[PDB]
């Protein structure tokens, strides 16, 4: 299974064994003003090997012209924060998941 996060942040190999669990934590990491501590990456060139950690947050290259670290046209900041509020639906709660 692929998606926006499966092939970009944590890929599960086919020959994988173990278990994954989840629980509701809507009253722990949710504030009316908003939480900005949690960040996630969105833009990358291609998928990577499973079981690795990526720390580099260089500027994304998406056009023929180079941006050289300048946040301008045709190059945006790939890291976005999780915008969560305590007045969301049943599918928009912060869940703490351990693998």
């Amino acid at each position, epitope marked *: 299974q*692929t*998606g*926006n996060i499966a*092939d*970009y942040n944590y890929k599960l190999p086919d020959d994988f064994t173990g278990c994954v669990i989840a629980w509701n934590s809507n009253k722990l990491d949710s504030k009316v003003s908003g939480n900005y501590n949690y960040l996630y990456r*969105l*833009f*990358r*060139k*291609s*998928n990577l090997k499973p079981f690795e950690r990526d720390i580099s947050t260089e500027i*994304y*290259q*998406a*056009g*023929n*012209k180079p941006c050289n670290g300048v946040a301008g*046209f*045709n190059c*945006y900041f790939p890291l*976005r924060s999780y*915008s*969560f*509020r305590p*007045t*969301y*639906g*049943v*599918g*928009h709660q912060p869940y703490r998941v351990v693998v």
Partner: antibody
Amino acid sequence: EVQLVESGGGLIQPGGSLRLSCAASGLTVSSNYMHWVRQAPGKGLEWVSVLYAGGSAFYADSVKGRFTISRNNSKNTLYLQMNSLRAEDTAIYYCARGLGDYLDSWGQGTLVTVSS
Amino acid sequence: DIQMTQSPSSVSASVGDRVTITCRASQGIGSWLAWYQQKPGKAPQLLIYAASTLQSGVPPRFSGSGSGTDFTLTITSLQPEDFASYYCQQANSVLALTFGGGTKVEIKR
């Protein structure tokens, strides 16, 4: 400085094969996301397909997945495969690109009509 | 089976009058929201990127925000070139599938 064009559309019999082309000026097709949106006459804009980094693509729930996405970085183009036509498929096609589950720049559009 | 609805279906207003459009979602979606202006004979253009920030090439008179399942958009100073279809697309977090019927506003004569 940024513009999108479409070509290859026109009259086609049902069950035929036709290949689309969409070139991006100043943008690399193998890096950014893509979107295809369909607008039937008298109906709103409807999403068709989205291209990921590679080896994965998601389609609409109603369709069975009759679009195959192939791209080449040699001349910065996009290629589509057409099969299993239906009378509902007669609509305009809008070449689109996406970022952050959002759409910013759309092409002028090409006409594809199915005449059963 | 997302089952979105847009109300009202149609509305008419003159230059400088009061008009607004409301978009409703069946399930709870976050603060993300977008609006599109579909002019016949041409491809529609983007209006907003974030929940409240405006796009660089659009006038800043557009006002619209929301937190729950209800969203709205309105114009402070109406212009004759703003008469087109209004579409709402908030978020889906997996593939960005949401779109309504729309509402068309017509120029007064």
